[PDB]
Amino acid sequence: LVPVYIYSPEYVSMCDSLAKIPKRASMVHSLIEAYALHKQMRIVKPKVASMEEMATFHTDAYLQHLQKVSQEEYGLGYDCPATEGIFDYAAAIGGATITAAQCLIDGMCKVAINWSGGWHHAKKDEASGFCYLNDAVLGILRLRRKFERILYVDLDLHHGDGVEDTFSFTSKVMTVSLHKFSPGFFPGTGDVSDVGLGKGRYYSVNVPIQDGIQDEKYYQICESVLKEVYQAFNPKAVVLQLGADTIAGDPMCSFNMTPVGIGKCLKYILQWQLATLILGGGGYNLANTARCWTYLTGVILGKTLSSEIPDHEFFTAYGPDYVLEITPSCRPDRNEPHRIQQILNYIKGNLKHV
Template identity: 50%
Template sequence: MTHSLITAFGLASKMQVVESRVALESQVRLFHSEEYVTLLQANADTLKPEEEEEYGLGYDCPVLPDLWGLVCQLAGGTLTAVDQLINGKAKVAINWCGGWHHAQRDSAAGFCYVNDIVLAIRVLQSKFDKILYLDLDVHHGDGVENAFLFSTKVMTVSLHQYEVGFFPGTGHITHTGVGKGRHYTLNIPYKPAINDQQFVHIFESVLYPICEVFRPDALVCQCGGDVLAGDPLGSANITPEGYKQCVQHILNINKPTLFLGGGGYNKANTAKLWTHITAKIINETIPSEIPEHDFFSQYGPSFEMDISPSLRKSDNTHQHIHHIITTTLDNIGKLTELLNKPL
């Protein structure tokens, strides 16, 4: 739906469209364990229930036909985008089919069978010394964070809804990394029904200080659509207009940047969002009316690109937003102190 909508607006012809290649087993193993890869390659009929449970397969990660083929296709799309950045063929690369941020080294989780984001960052490290990862999905980017908890070369920043019972239950504001990687992880949790003004205010208040201190050589951004108003799994109240403001701030950093998809469980709204962001990235204005194309009927009854916020009042008070920002800036300050400490 996303790619059809992008094409319907004539945006694809204004970008370099690169055919995705399939990831190699050796590339998937850059992060995932040998045991997990072997399980993914196994015939679904041969898997035992206890094996599925041990490796996170089941309820939200069902065993699908040709699961290994799916994993290699998903990872391959993101790695193809990475190649464009490494080879200098693009300053910005996009793969809306990527962004599977919950997958762990040895297990699937939260609909994610492969962590293409971690694979992308690992490959990007072959050229770019320091990489900043930004996660805008409504859920905590736990898989990516866990992969780089001890790293001083990869800084992970996740804005996400955080409350009791909300998946995955991690990402408290006090969790800032481990060991040498202490203060290179930032978690920015908010309460339900956060609105555009609050979301953008938090993001712009912390992004520039982060970049001033960490000085990244490349950026990776996961653009989950489940933060949108009306998403059945998220409780945020964001519109594409607010999201695009965050994207513009990312573009302002002016570094090689990889944009990836992620969650989004209202399919029509998610396709709208990623089309809006694509237009923002290439500095194109698109009309509000959706053109006729293969999936046109799924955008009714309005057939427009706008997504209206709900009438629900944000649970995030002014005081709470202030607390989030000041605590995050304090955590960034601790990284500054660490970097300025004499050897």
């Protein structure tokens, strides 16, 4: 009944070294610790993923290449620099999510959290969008050993293309992604008409959304889709990716959400009372990402947190207001109601086939 919190000092330090988000893992953990939330959770040390565990998804040629560049193509480049920490980072993140999955299998908990996971872009032999290894896929494949139908819900700002593509030809894993979809915006995929292929047709769900969406409309959309998905797909377990790059104040400056709105989505999923693997993802206003995942941990624990950020290691990063709540930016919501309705009707039509 007590949620599992994947953590070790070594893991945080490892994750802290991803050059795109320096120290973010420490900031998230430190704030969670400052609110004393870890004492209400079962703290589980993550294992490091073995080569064989990583090879359940990634090809050996790809994994050997990561090993090679870590010691001395494949999507390595501007977004995914080939640096020496690559292989150990992959094994650690993957291992953490696999550990969370295993805890859920063993019935240790109903909810297991790896805030440093959620790297949804990576494919079997291609790095993409800061993702060297797809830990979300790894967790789904582990859960698959016990659970017959798995629902993957992706609330990151970006389309969960790596996870959806991996399971596009299957009906045993359904992917649902809400994301910004606009020509030029990474990764450029995930229109409402993308529904999966072959036996998996209608088992991929995409909700293309525009800039400026706020809490109430987002939840209305998310609740509407998830309601139909639940009744049509009847999932036995859930993997939930909660990238905080949708949150107001993110330098990506696209959606205009607060952790409260995401929390309502989280609450809706939690009341299904299924085994649920919780993952992080994007989130580039580092203090806000910590504010968000701290609040969401509170939501998982059913606790209401004090508005004042406690003094702690990174306290100075929480200016100018030093509170946990995030105020939406004063800019317009570019989502026109009729288009949103069209999308919801298209999805509903798709789910009748499921």
